[PDB]
Write a protein that binds this DNA or RNA. Structure first.
Ligand SMILES: O=C(O)CCC(=O)C(=O)O
Ligand SMILES: O=C(O)CCC(=O)C(=O)O
Ligand SMILES: O=C(O)CCC(=O)C(=O)O
Ligand SMILES: O=C(O)CCC(=O)C(=O)O
Lengths: 84, 213, 215, 84, 216, 213, 85
DNA sequence: ATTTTTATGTATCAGCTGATACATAAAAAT
DNA sequence: TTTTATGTATCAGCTGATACATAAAAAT
DNA sequence: ATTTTTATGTATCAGCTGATACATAAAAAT
DNA sequence: ATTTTTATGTATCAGCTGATACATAAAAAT
């Protein structure tokens, strides 16, 4: 539920973190998705499509069950069911 | 110009043939192409999980669509349902061939921004139509657009040169097929329209437009 | 990104950023359409006015948006028909069509960056079509609120405050309704604890949640 | 959206057809899934878990595109979306 | 499946006869020696506690192929019952003794398997009810319970699922820890939400799944 | 006998150790095991995707759980969250070795069905508690079960020998932690309980039960 | 008010002593009763039901009356009263 | 500082319009 | 057949139209 | 067939209880 | 040892929901 203003596409919201690139998406029905790089250079962006972004959050869900906690599994679960 | 310029991006570029009712692109497809309608009509629609279709616009000849590809490239996935409402001819140039083609021809970039402009206004024109409250006023506004884009001159008025279902109309003006039928029948009693071979024909369009003072 | 940079170099040198104060009109119906604009900071309200005195908001544009798009079709020959007003304090560029004719053949780099801008417009206008194509005025309002939050929303303590002051009538003009109904529906959102009006600004809560409802 | 009364677990509802073996699921949160076949006797329920049931409806989606209509997929898409 | 078949062969000689019970008839009372194990074949069985204040609390409402009278398994005839097994509806069932069962278990290892299957089901169904009552929102709690009803006694209907059994507002209230009045109150609010309909004292849900989606 | 019979299903079978808060099984794990709690307490809970926890039962010593494995075998996947609420010792025999062990010992089959029976009743006892209307009555009913299963004899009453968070309690009674405290505070003013070292202590358990005639 | 932890049933509490043979009972609603044989490893939890359990406490009440202390007669009255009245 | 013009809250009822269901015509299937 | 589209009828409940009191904003 | 007991719909009002927010104590953390 | 994270006490609202009472419908009694 973290927000970020894209120059062209306006407001975005965070889907998940990775390691630390976080996944972000458009607010009206999430048609586009963005990989962000908070470098000293600043805010580096990298657009991705539904097909790739679906399986990518899917991978993170599998990663949290295997070697990770639950609170974060449960909340990302709601995020995934919200988007896809 | 648009017809002429798109002929030269690829070796020429072949006119793709698409049959009646065939889908052009589905939601989920990578947006890697820009399209140009040459002959016929194309319905762009949004589909919900409830199974509901909403017509975004019904595009006519020399129109540019598939415009998602110009923002991020093949990176983004489609979301609308592009279906040929009638038999259609079109061109289908890729984004990476277009990045080439724009720096190549500044005459084409002129030609393209022309087509894009037209789209904005035609889509904004539709906003005017839907922003009415009287569904009566809203329907006529929509009818006028159809006559503008697909109407052919006729003996007593203008026949909208394409077959249209009451649901297809209802999906475009935010209504049920029922209400479309009701209001059309009331215009037939007012004898402002006629249905000939399933085709809607307008009587004295201008008089209908003058009701939008 | 490049739009702000490219418009800088069509030069009256570059071209000066025009300042416009709040509520000031940029163009009216009847003006010769000989220019294209680029909004830099703030919001631009495009509206149609009827003889009855009624205003209908067509689109409410955001930063890095191209408008005044009539000028590219016939040129100076056509007269405008919408009412472009500065909805907030605004910065913009304003280059002519004849200076643009030169600018396009000059730079096919700008041609690329321009069609990118016009693309965005198509979608944003089409996005609005989705909103108004709803039946439920409740659903229709939230859909519209989501767009405002997308374009003008700023991060807030408990939610998203849409960073612009909006009148109930201005909302009603955009969603095809009366001020009354907007007020009533907003009140029902306050009881559902989904919004809050703090300093005359609408604030949604985890709008995300609101968007699911629009599967 | 077809229903069937399991002796032990009560009411069940159909997920998808295959060819004609159908997938069925439990009503309170689809907590489990059943492979049914209409032998003259039926009497042939084969239970399966979430992980297997997931990829099985998933294969059917692809299959539809590879070789089937849109809505049969349009419809089963609804189903997968609701259960998964 | 097998439970109905296996209980058939533990007979008075012979098979064992199917015992018939009419609507409202009690099967066992508090104070009876628990010496028998039952299996419901068709209809519904309501297990309840009765207080001195005259208050009834429904523990579980059992469906077909369910094993009950499970007290007899622990000590045998030695213990006395404390719940009120009444025949929620017209009911058919078997009634084998614990001493007949001791022999029947060493006799058939196949029945041993089929029995623990039935007991497992009971644990879950009772635990499922725990989920329902652990709600805070009485609205949420009631729908959760209604979902169970459908699951167990729901028959396919034109527009949804009609629970194929009659229900007393009090009977519902006793099961979900509420008063009759609220039950009526909440049901009327679901009628305005048009998620349910009562035709001929029979309740009927629509888009069941859709109701379940509200409990993510 | 349960502790004794489980010892011999292996060679012998090793007692698994688990520390406080450690999870035993998660939703998504194949149900292939049958468990027996030896020392301490086990919390079974349901997790919603909203992040909400609901306590199904708080199990005591010599209790059998992991009961799904008996229905299809390894075929089914769990859906509750088995967590060691306290420092815990357990046995954990597989279903396929149990199929052997039950036909091996008809003595343990008796001891096992004893265990399963107790579970049904204890779970049904909880149904009585939550079928209350008065949250005050509902809380005490639950407290009585706690005192029955975990309570130790004390100088002035019965101290429930385990530390419980209001939330844990609340999740179990399906209410707000505040309400938990709120009500507790009101029983402190009525001086029916005392909280010493974060442990609940009832004054005269019989007297509280007499309020449930 | 003496307690004993049954493996399966958990906490129990003593009803009456007897000559060995202390009657014990379950804690929640006292829904069962047990004859405990406190022998060296002679521990036995022989289960009995309410009907037998009732008359058995009742018998000890009469027994203390004829030739048995008042204090203990007074106390058993309490237990009987709580379990059965 | 006084005005006044414009925006907002509140309360009603009339009628178009969405939801549901059915008969019949047209068009696609077949 | 068989699917899909269309006309017709009848409802419940939003929602537009009308009118008024009061607050806020712009004008002055 | 007569009566009558039980079930249902509707209307009201008083208070517990969930939601929200804050200060402070207790426990984990490091 | 410090800090800081987690648990607890207090204070105040609004709105379910239990209590109370009545007329009428449906079911069991007769
Ligand atoms: O560009 C897309 O992929 C979808 C939208 C579209 O085709 C268009 O509006 O032109
Ligand atoms: O271009 C016009 O004349 C009206 C629409 C518009 O201004 C725009 O969208 O830019
Ligand atoms: O076990 C008993 O005798 C009473 C309750 C019951 O039969 C059961 O729930 O199985
Ligand atoms: O057995 C299961 O897998 C779930 C229920 C449970 O944990 C149990 O009672 O054993």
């Amino acid at each position: 539920e973290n927000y970020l203003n894209h120059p062209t596409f306006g407001l975005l919201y965070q889907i998940c973190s990775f390691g630390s690139k976080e996944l972000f998406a458009t607010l009206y029905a999430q048609r586009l998705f963005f990989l962000v790089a908070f470098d000293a250079r600043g805010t580096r962006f990298e657009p991705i499509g539904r097909n790739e972004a679906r399986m990518l959050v899917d991978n993170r869900l599998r990663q949290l069950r295997r070697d990770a906690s639950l609170q974060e599994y449960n909340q990302l679960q709601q995020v995934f069911k919200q988007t896809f | 110009s648009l017809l002429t310029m798109f002929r030269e991006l690829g070796l020429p570029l072949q006119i793709e043939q698409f049959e009646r009712g065939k889908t052009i692109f589905f939601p989920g497809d990578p947006a890697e192409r820009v399209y140009l309608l040459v002959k016929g009509a194309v319905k762009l629609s949004r589909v919900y999980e409830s199974g509901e279709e909403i017509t975004v616009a019904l595009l006519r000849e020399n129109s540019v669509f598939g415009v998602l590809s110009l923002l991020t490239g093949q990176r983004s996935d489609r979301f609308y349902h592009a279906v040929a409402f009638t038999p259609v001819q079109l061109f289908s140039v890729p984004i990476e061939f277009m990045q080439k083609a724009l720096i190549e021809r500044p005459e084409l970039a002129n030609v393209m921004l022309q087509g894009l402009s037209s789209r904005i206004l035609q889509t904004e024109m539709m906003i005017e139509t839907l922003a009415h409250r009287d569904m009566g006023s809203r329907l006529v506004s929509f009818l006028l657009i159809l006559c503008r884009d697909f109407g052919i001159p006729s003996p007593d008025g203008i026949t909208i040169d394409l077959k249209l279902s009451h649901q297809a109309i209802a999906e475009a003006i935010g209504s049920t097929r029922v209400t479309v039928t009701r209001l059309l029948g009331d215009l037939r009693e007012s004898k402002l329209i006629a249905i000939h071979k399933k085709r809607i024909t307008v009587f004295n369009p201008v008089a209908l437009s003058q009701q939008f003072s």
